[PDB]
Design an enzyme around this catalytic site. Sequence first.
Site, mmCIF file in Angstrom:
data_model
loop_
_atom_site.group_PDB
_atom_site.id
_atom_site.type_symbol
_atom_site.label_atom_id
_atom_site.label_comp_id
_atom_site.label_asym_id
_atom_site.label_seq_id
_atom_site.Cartn_x
_atom_site.Cartn_y
_atom_site.Cartn_z
ATOM 1 N N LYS A 106 63.190 36.464 26.663
ATOM 2 C CA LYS A 106 64.248 37.008 27.508
ATOM 3 C C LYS A 106 65.297 35.945 27.779
ATOM 4 O O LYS A 106 66.493 36.227 27.799
ATOM 5 C CB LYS A 106 63.654 37.562 28.808
ATOM 6 C CG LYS A 106 62.843 38.832 28.608
ATOM 7 C CD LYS A 106 62.188 39.287 29.919
ATOM 8 C CE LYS A 106 61.727 40.739 29.864
ATOM 9 N NZ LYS A 106 60.667 40.979 28.847
ATOM 10 N N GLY A 120 66.774 33.612 56.601
ATOM 11 C CA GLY A 120 66.787 35.061 56.541
ATOM 12 C C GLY A 120 66.407 35.705 57.859
ATOM 13 O O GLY A 120 66.824 36.818 58.154
ATOM 14 N N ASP A 166 61.241 32.702 62.458
ATOM 15 C CA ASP A 166 59.788 32.685 62.518
ATOM 16 C C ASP A 166 59.317 31.748 63.608
ATOM 17 O O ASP A 166 59.663 30.562 63.602
ATOM 18 C CB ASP A 166 59.237 32.237 61.163
ATOM 19 C CG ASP A 166 59.710 33.127 60.042
ATOM 20 O OD1 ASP A 166 59.377 34.324 60.099
ATOM 21 O OD2 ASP A 166 60.409 32.650 59.123
HETATM 22 MG MG LIG Z 1 61.628 33.520 57.717
HETATM 23 NA NA NA Z 2 59.989 36.195 59.184
#
Ligand SMILES: [Mg+2]
Ligand code: NA
Length: 326
Positions: free
Chosen positions: A63, A180, A183
């Site tokens: 690929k 993102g 946490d």
């Molecule tokens: Mg995170």
């Molecule tokens: Na998270």
Amino acid sequence: TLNGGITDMLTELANFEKNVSQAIHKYNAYRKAASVIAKYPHKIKSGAEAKKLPGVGTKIAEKIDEFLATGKLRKLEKIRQDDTSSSINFLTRVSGIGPSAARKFVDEGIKTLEDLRKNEDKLNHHQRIGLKYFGDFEKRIPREEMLQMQDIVLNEVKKVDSEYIATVCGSFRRGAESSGDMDVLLTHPSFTSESTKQPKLLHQVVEQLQKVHFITDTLSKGETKFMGVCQLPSKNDEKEYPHRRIDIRLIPKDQYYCGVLYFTGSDIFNKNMRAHALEKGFTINEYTIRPLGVTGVAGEPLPVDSEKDIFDYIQWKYREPKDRSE
DNA sequence: CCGACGGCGCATCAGC
DNA sequence: GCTGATGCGCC
DNA sequence: GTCGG
Ligand SMILES: [Mg+2]
Ligand code: NA
Ligand SMILES: [Cl-]
Ligand SMILES: [Cl-]
Ligand SMILES: [Mg+2]
Ligand code: NA
Ligand code: NA
């Protein structure tokens, strides 16, 4: 990003395998290959060159040769043109909608953002919130904002009980310039591997964060894990900040090192490290590292007094959090 | 060739 | 109600 | 899809 074209290609293939094909081992294979290629410090000139890397095999090398030659992959070109695949891939971008739900929705003729919005009654609680904040959840969080969020959480936790310790993990602890989501690993001396001396330890923290309007919605919540939504406060006349995903995990205090190892990730790093542990005769989770007996049953937890101790058991040189972004 | 591929919390549901 | 399976989430 | 034996 010397090889960004290639890693993008493999990530797209990985997502197709997870979301459409429902082939989790192919998904992990593609993601492992993308990761090893991402760290490779040369601009790849052939599939054969790539095939020397661990996790890149014959099919991926092929690929890569096609992609280098033409700038695209016919296989992905066809996938992009497939309506069912396209629809399924889109729906899984909503938090709470996985491969199974996505395919079921598409069967019922629900395949666009508009369709979802008009069919809220068909969504569970998690999915409803995922839909509500669809746009917001695909935005990344600047580290500057993560620092503001850290200050709010650490200070509010302290107000609840000075004995809590909250540690921001995930990409933030790995030093990323954007994340993102947020946490948070939480400990309290009243919750250990040996006993729970106080009830509602996680609840009281969630409650306090809701009270000050930091936590805005809940996706799921138990005794040890919260999964929800939060938002920074904005100033007078100021546009609102996007809503953000937040995860809070309460870990037994005496198992902090295994917990922070887990919650620091990355996910691919954890998979790679845990697989290496197995090859070395150990099993690692967020609580303990244990030996594997002759049979295959895990033995008793080994002493851990640092993250590094865990690396030592499996004969790996220590890697700082910033070097675990695989 | 072929078995393994990381490990687990919470939500939802089927069977009893 | 409980238990186990499964989906979906987290790193 | 890739690896190890
Ligand atoms: Mg995170
Ligand atoms: Na998270
Ligand atoms: Cl698979
Ligand atoms: Cl354990
Ligand atoms: Mg993640
Ligand atoms: Na290879
Ligand atoms: Na999803």
